[PDB]
């Protein structure tokens, strides 16, 4: 009766699919990456919306940063993973602009579909995108108007860090800018390498964001097991061995042969531990922090000679304490410490937010390390501010590597859209269509800023080209109210991450080119 079509030449798979051509492979990779660009388009900008994303571990992640959203979404399309790993490389390089990659490369592949269906194949759209990408790296040093050079203190960086804060925390742009100014400048290495790992976030559940502060030191979440919690001298002896004595390594066996060696063994072990605790009490130590466990005999002489004990079960937190108070973790049992002692100002305990913490607070010598103690009503809010805190530390490392800045908020992408269109009209070849489409991908980036603010993007994008008549080069977007009448970005102070714009254009161009190189897809059976 009804016939059917069998295999033809190479149907040898056991349950796997195959894609070949432009319509089955190239056009389907574009439409799959277009859905990720339309997903994070709402969360882009200062007026972006959050997204409650639940992973496979059945926990809640609510954020507006596009980097942490893609880590929880279990994407299975292969070409869609290329735009995720390109956004993950933006977080590892500069730490800001991960969403800029999804909008630009999502518009590069979308406008490439209009070129393959009207004209040139992938051999000329790729070569056309590479010419406009090299010309885009020549306009970005010409768009630099300000620099983070004069008065590197807490006053100038309080305004230069507001752009990375207001894109994810719009209402808290003033409080979080001052908290990131008293923490990043205080750990300055005196013209050296700025380490972003020297800033920790201690999430304390409690009151709102107005009670958050930055403490010069470290705040832990453990106990003391003692009664010497009030320490004012703060001479800290840091150890990595377990503070319970010196045991052997191979087997361990007490060998008793007479009645005198049995009775004197218990009293001789207590006198041996008594001589080791009093050896560090005569050196002036007050805080003894160990990594391993602590026996009951070590706690007996710790309270007798009035020294405080701190238990640190994490081995990574012990190395950060050595850079906090300026000490060295000794692997052997307690010696007379010559010069590797710690020196803090005040080590105390306080129950803040129904959580007994241990604070190594520096008062006079303020700059050795910083810890931003964040407060919040929910645990999900403190994770979102911590992402905004880490975007402020990563922006400070960008200004250490390169002090140049470009005016953001839509002012950079319009001038990049005007100069590439000028190079496209002066190219007497067939690849000038991809150069004109490369400049229109920069046009869609302030389009996402106006659609998230409830403003019509047609009237917004028309006023940007009207005020960019060859000499302004700075007017961006005013998203404070409807009927914008947009203003200057240097007067408002919206400029951030010139090095972030240098890498996000390069990574999104290489991501969109790599998708267009894929002509034949051979997948396996998922298991």
């Amino acid at each position: 009766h009804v016939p059917k079509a069998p295999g033809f030449a190479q149907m040898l798979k056991e349950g796997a699919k195959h894609f070949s051509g432009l319509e089955e492979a190239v056009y389907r990779n574009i439409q799959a990456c277009k859905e990720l660009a339309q997903t994070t388009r709402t969360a882009y900008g200062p007026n972006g919306m959050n997204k409650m994303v639940i992973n496979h571990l059945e926990k809640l992640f609510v954020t507006n940063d596009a980097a942490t959203i893609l880590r929880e979404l279990e994407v299975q399309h292969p070409a869609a993973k290329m735009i995720v790993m390109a956004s993950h490389m933006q977080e590892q390089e500069v730490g800001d602009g991960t969403n800029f990659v999804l909008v630009f490369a999502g518009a590069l592949l979308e406008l490439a579909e209009e070129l393959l269906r009207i004209g040139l194949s992938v051999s000329e759209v790729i070569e056309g995108y590479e010419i406009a990408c090299r010309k885009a790296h020549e306009i970005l040093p010409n768009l630099v108007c300000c620099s983070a050079k004069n008065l590197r203190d807490i006053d100038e960086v309080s305004s230069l860090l507001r752009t990375s804060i207001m894109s994810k925390q719009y209402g808290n742009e003033v409080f979080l800018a001052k908290l990131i100014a008293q923490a990043c400048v205080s750990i300055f290495p005196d013209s050296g390498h700025f380490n972003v790992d020297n800033i920790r976030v201690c999430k304390i559940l409690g009151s709102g964001i107005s009670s958050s502060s930055v403490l010069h030191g470290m705040v832990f979440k453990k106990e003391t097991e003692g009664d010497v919690t009030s320490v004012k001298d703060a001479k800290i002896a840091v150890y990595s061995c377990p503070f319970d004595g010196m045991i052997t390594e191979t087997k361990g066996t007490v060998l008793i042969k007479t009645a005198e060696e049995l009775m004197n063994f218990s009293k001789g072990e207590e006198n041996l531990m008594d001589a080791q605790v009093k050896a560090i009490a005569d050196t002036g130590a007050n805080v003894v922090v160990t990594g391993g466990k602590v026996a009951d005999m070590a706690l007996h002489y710790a309270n007798k000679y009035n020294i405080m004990l701190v238990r640190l079960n994490s081995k990574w937190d012990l190395r950060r304490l050595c850079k906090t108070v300026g000490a060295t973790a000794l692997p052997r049992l307690t010696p007379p410490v010559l010069e590797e002692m710690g020196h803090c100002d005040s080590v105390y305990l306080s129950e803040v937010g129904d959580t007994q913490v241990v604070v190594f607070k520096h008062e006079k010598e303020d700059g050795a390390i910083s810890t931003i103690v964040l407060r919040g009503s929910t645990d999900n809010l403190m994770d979102d501010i911590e992402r905004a805190v880490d975007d402020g530390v990563n922006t400070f490392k960008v200004l250490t590597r390169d002090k140049r800045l470009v005016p953001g908020g839509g002012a950079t992408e319009i001038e990049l859209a005007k100069q590439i269109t000028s190079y496209g009209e002066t190219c007497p070849g067939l690849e000038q269509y991809a150069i004109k489409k490369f400049a229109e991908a920069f046009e869609a980036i302030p389009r996402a800023l106006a659609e998230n603010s409830g403003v019509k993007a047609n009237e917004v994008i028309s006023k940007l080209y009207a005020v960019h008549q060859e000499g302004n080069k700075n007017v961006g977007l005013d998203i404070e109210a409807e009927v914008p009448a947009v203003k200057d970005m240097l007067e408002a102070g919206i400029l951030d991450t010139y090095l972030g714009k240098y890498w996000a254009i390069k990574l999104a161009t290489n991501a969109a080119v790599t998708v267009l190189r894929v002509d034949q897809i051979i997948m396996a059976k998922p298991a």
Binding site: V2, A457, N458
Partner: protein, 526 residues
Amino acid sequence: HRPVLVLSQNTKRESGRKVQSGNINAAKTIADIIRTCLGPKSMMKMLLDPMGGIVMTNDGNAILREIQVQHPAAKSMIEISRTQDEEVGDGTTSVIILAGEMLSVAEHFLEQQMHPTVVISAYRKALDDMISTLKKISIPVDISDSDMMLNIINSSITTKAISRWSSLACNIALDAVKMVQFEENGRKEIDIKKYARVEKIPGGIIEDSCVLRGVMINKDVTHPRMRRYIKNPRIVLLDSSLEYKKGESQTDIEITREEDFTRILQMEEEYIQQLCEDIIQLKPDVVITEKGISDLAQHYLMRANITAIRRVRKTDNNRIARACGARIVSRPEELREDDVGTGAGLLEIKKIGDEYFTFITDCKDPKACTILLRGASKEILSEVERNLQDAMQVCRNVLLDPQLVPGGGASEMAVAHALTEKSKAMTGVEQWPYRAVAQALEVIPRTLIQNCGASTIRLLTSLRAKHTQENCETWGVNGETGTLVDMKELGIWEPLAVKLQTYKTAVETAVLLLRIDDIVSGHKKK
């Protein structure tokens, strides 16, 4: 087991951007199926039927009717090609590509936070300007000329599979419409479906196919003594039976005497001989009816030298009534001289492949003809039958509207420059969707070069520059070679009713599918 307190059980709800941008992708999917079936360099598409048959064709209407889709917006595009198939002949594949392209540019404006009523109000203003452009570039046709009408039907079958036998299929389709063009009262009508029957017989060659001057049926004579070759027969068409049947009552006869049962059996024979004596008063030669003929009626027509056909269909009786000029009567005692089919030519009972066929041909002025198709098998004869239906309807549109539009890409580019020059005086938010209608018409010259393998960049830049001047305005795309030849030299001309129905249906398909922002599925009915 307690029931769940729900509302609108077992149905779906979907709104927002997933329905506006979801119906565009369903329209782009159908337009990519028949995209390789528009130019003259097209290829056939073999289809498989649930009955077990095979439809190997390249016509855009016959492909989409064999596709069962589940998407609701995909079901709308199939009914568009069914509308274009019934209005005109060769207006199928062009509307589905054009409606997919007008929705392709409509998806761009839906992402710009523009309301769909603004794009439709710009589509209706653009639709009213495409009708006025085709009426300015048209040309009056001399319908009395034979060589002028052959160039119109050859332009419609160059895409189809009968372009190889173009010298034969043009003469068949032209003579088929000119025979069935009947006008009794003050109203001209052309019925090429009820009177122009296209019968196909497996065997022979395609070059021996010709339109008969008359009708033909697959029916043998009722008796071998009847003549199978009459020079000039007088055909009488009947509708009732020549038998003895039960009346529409509760008739019952009480038989008490001995002579009563033999009398009723004799009155059944005298009733058949009475109606057989009433049909021989006009001296006929051929008696054709729709119901059965008893053997008592075959005996009286045998010695009267009357050839009788038994079970001719009702649609075949209406077709032979126009060819021979007879009247289909339903009462043998009410026959008149006007009900006799005089003027009929040669009648011959031929045999084509171990089966008899009744031929009634060589008529004086027949108003209904039958196209005799003979080919290799029934597979390719269904292709020629579907192509001649697209060849006779494009001749019907010229005889009712003698205006020609320069096809082959010259029709779409002459309006796309007219919409571009008229868009300069818009000065509003509807100016940019007005420009996209002129860019959506570019997909018809895009398809003619993508099927032959030509370049779409070097050709469309030169073709758009040819319509910048108002003098030439008729330069199209030559699908045979791949260069730009003027359509006044090639001879590719499409009728006005084909191009007007193509533009009116492709816009209103985009009007319907853009106002859909919600889809409810999962409910039942009666």
